[PDB]
Amino acid sequence: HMRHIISLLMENEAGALSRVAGLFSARGYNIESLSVAPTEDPTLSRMTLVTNGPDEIVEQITKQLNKLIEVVKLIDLSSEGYVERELMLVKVRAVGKDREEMKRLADIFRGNIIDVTNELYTIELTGTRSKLDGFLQAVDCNLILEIARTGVSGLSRGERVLKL
Amino acid sequence: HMRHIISLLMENEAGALSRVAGLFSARGYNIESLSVAPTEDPTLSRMTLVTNGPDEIVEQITKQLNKLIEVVKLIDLSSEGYVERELMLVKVRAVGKDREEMKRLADIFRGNIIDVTNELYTIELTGTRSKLDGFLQAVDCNLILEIARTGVSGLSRGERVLKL
Ligand SMILES: [Ca+2]
Numbered sequence: 387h388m389r390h391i392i393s394l395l396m397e398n399e400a401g402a403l404s405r406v407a408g409l410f411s412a413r414g415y416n417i418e419s420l421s422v423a424p425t426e427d428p429t430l431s432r433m434t435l436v437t438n439g440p441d442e443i444v445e446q447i448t449k450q451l452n453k454l455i456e457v458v459k460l461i462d463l464s465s466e467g468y469v470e471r472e473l474m475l476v477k478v479r480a481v482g483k484d485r486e487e488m489k490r491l492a493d494i495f496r497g498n499i500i501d502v503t504n505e506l507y508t509i510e511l512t513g514t515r516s517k518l519d520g521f522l523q524a525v526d527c528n529l530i531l532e533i534a535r536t537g538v539s540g541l542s543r544g545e546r547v548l549k550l
Numbered sequence: 551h552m553r554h555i556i557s558l559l560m561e562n563e564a565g566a567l568s569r570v571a572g573l574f575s576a577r578g579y580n581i582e583s584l585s586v587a588p589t590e591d592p593t594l595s596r597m598t599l600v601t602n603g604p605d606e607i608v609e610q611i612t613k614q615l616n617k618l619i620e621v622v623k624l625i626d627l628s629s630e631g632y633v634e635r636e637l638m639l640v641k642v643r644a645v646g647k648d649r650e651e652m653k654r655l656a657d658i659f660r661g662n663i664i665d666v667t668n669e670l671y672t673i674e675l676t677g678t679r680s681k682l683d684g685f686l687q688a689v690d691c692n693l694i695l696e697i698a699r700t701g702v703s704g705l706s707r708g709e710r711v712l713k714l
């Protein structure tokens with residue numbers, strides 16, 4: 387039951403994504419998080435999807451995904467060197483001494499405050515999964531007003547590219 | 551008309567995604583970018599989605615969308631003050647004088663190199679849509695080896711929050 391980061395190229399067209407999400411849904415496959423946006427080439431979008439399972443489940447999801455005509459290339463990004471980043475926006479209640487505390491946490495995690503009132507901050511964070519998770523462990527939950535978190539975006543290390 | 555950024559707070563069921571994605575697909579409308587990931591509410595995910603069509607029509611989907619039990623709340627983020635950021639990973643061919651040149655761009659856009667060889671950089675860039683777009687506008691496209699870009703993560707400004 388471990389994390390695989392699936393990376394795929396697909397037809398930037400209507401239904402493309404609803405069909406990819408439908409394939410998971412039909413069979414109750416987990417989607418932890420999902421990023422998709424156009425590439426260099428506007429006919430093709432790049433999707434980064436994170437799923438949680440034993441290998442034999444992932445290999446079957448991977449088998450089924452390749453079968454879709456709108457899925458063009460596909461790699462388990464996790465099976466080779468890669469880099470990943472996520473972006474997160476955390477809106478936090480920040481009054482009295484918690485104003486200093488929230489500012490210290492932002493600086494420690496190298497985030498930036500991008501919205502501010504007398505009683506709140508919106509903090510922008512970028513990093514690996516664990517950095518962003520470490521931020522959330524470190525903040526008191528009762529302070530969090532809401533969170534918007536982009537889901538992982540990754541690339542293979544070095545010369546390896548998905549389109550080739 | 552135009553560009554719309556829709557935030558939804560929903561169940562993390564696969565395709566609850568597909569079902570949301572479907573209602574844009576249903577009308578023949580392309581989802582340009584999309585992000586969905588866990589929130590503090592372990593059972594709930596936040597999804598931002600950027601799309602293109604006429605206000606009344608989006609408002610059609612809006613309604614259709616609200617009536618899904620899987621959807622807790624939604625707003626059209628543009629209808630009120632908001633902050634938005636995307637993240638992007640851009641792998642570039644960086645040989646000779648382009649090494650100095652590609653590093654300068656990174657610096658000017660305030661991005662970070664997170665993968666480097668003799669012949670390439672992968673640059674991480676975080677910002678508004680127009681900033682990332684402007685970075686892409688600045689690089690000769692024969693230098694871009696691949697891009698993985700997340701699409702928006704957005705929140706209302708100030709005390710406005712979606713779960714409320
Ligand atoms: Ca295929």
Ligand SMILES: [Ca+2]
Nearest residue numbers: 616618619621
């Ligand atoms: Ca509802």
